[PDB]
Design a protein around this ligand. Structure first.
Ligand SMILES: CN(C)C(=O)[C@H]1CCC=C[C@H]1NC(=O)OCc1ccc(C(=O)NCCOP(=O)(O)O)cc1
Length: 319
């Protein structure tokens, strides 16, 4: 397997459980602080022990100054946001939260909780990662048990993690379940803009699953799509496509980001990181620059990739 060792530049530090790197439509950069994430890493099992409410930070990319935008809590229950995407129609962030479900967060710091329950009427589970398709439907992973006020649990040892689609008609549809800690998630699109495949990381099992997408909340042909190397504690966390539809995957605990070609299988290349625990990654729009969050130093870095990123939904035109 070829390996590259590109230069990484540190942008900021001292952000517990650093995750959800995202750019909005104005090109502003946000990251998520997650005390619960950091705690789950330091614990020896059931420990997670009341944690503080994680918040969303604006990070100035020239100066490194952090500004707290929002510290979500609902009804005394601190949120644990973990993954972010920017909307297309309007400038707002959709934030998967392991305690509160799906949030929509404004730049001025107000936020709405989107779903107490799903469309079949079952309680909502805590959400971690999300990806918009080009239709505006949000696919979401849910590795946690029920949202607050249920006790916090995560499917890291047992199969109860679920997948949702929040559709453009505002329905939260459970589309699959019994995952062991579903993590990063992505939508492979055809060159003509059609959504084609849903890729979901199952973290501790060192597997990437795929489904064929036939429409809003309509998936089939569930298959193991990619093998993640290594026997370390961890496995695939965040993931993003490049313009050529190669899938880059943070392999938490391995010191590498894995690169898969469009047909999956085994990684075609690995990216060696100067740290063991890459967690999440996102491209700077219209650039080759990848921002990566990391749990050795609770830091955010950047490196230049060989090509530009795939457009997110937020970068596409209403026309
Ligand atoms: C930390 N991380 C990269 C995540 O993506 C979070 C966020 C939400 C979704 C998945 C989470 N994954 C995670 O926390 O993985 C790290 C991890 C934490 C605990 C464990 C665990 O099973 N036990 C902790 C003690 O294990 P040992 O020390 O005995 O090996 C394994 C991996």
């Amino acid at each position: 397997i070829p390996v590259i060792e590109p230069l990484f530049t540190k942008m900021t530090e001292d952000i517990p459980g650093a995750t959800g790197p995202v750019f909005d439509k104005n090109g502003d950069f946000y990251v998520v602080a997650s005390p619960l994430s950091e705690a789950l890493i330091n614990a020896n099992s059931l420990a997670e022990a009341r944690s503080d409410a994680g918040e969303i930070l604006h990070i100035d990319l020239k100066t490194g100054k952090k500004t707290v935008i929002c510290k979500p809590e609902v009804n005394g229950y601190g949120g644990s946001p973990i993954g972010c995407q920017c909307d297309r129609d309007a400038n707002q962030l959709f934030v998967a939260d392991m305690r509160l479900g799906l949030l929509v967060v404004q730049t001025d710091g107000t936020f709405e909780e989107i779903a107490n329950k799903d469309s079949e009427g079952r309680c909502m589970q805590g959400c971690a990662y999300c990806a918009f398709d080009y239709e505006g439907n949000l696919w979401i992973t849910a590795p946690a048990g029920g949202v607050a006020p249920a006790d916090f649990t995560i499917s890291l040892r047992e199969k109860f993690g679920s997948i949702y689609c929040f559709t453009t008609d505002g329905q939260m549809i459970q589309v699959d379940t019994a995952f062991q800690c579903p993590a990063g998630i992505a939508v492979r699109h055809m060159n003509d803009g059609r959504p084609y495949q849903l890729i979901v990381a199952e973290q501790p099992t060192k597997k990437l699953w795929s489904y064929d997408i036939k429409g809003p909340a309509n998936i089939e042909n569930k298959k193991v799509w990619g093998h993640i190397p290594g026997t370390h504690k961890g496995g695939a966390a965040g993931m993003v496509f490049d313009e050529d539809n190669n899938l880059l995957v943070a392999n938490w605990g391995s010191s590498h980001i894995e690169v898969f070609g469009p047909d999956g299988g085994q990684p075609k290349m690995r990216i060696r990181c100067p740290f063991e625990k890459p967690a999440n990654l996102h491209f700077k729009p219209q650039t080759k620059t990848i921002f990566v969050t990391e749990h050795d130093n609770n830091a955010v870095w950047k490196f230049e990739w060989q090509r530009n990123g795939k457009k997110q939904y937020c970068e596409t035109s209403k026309f």
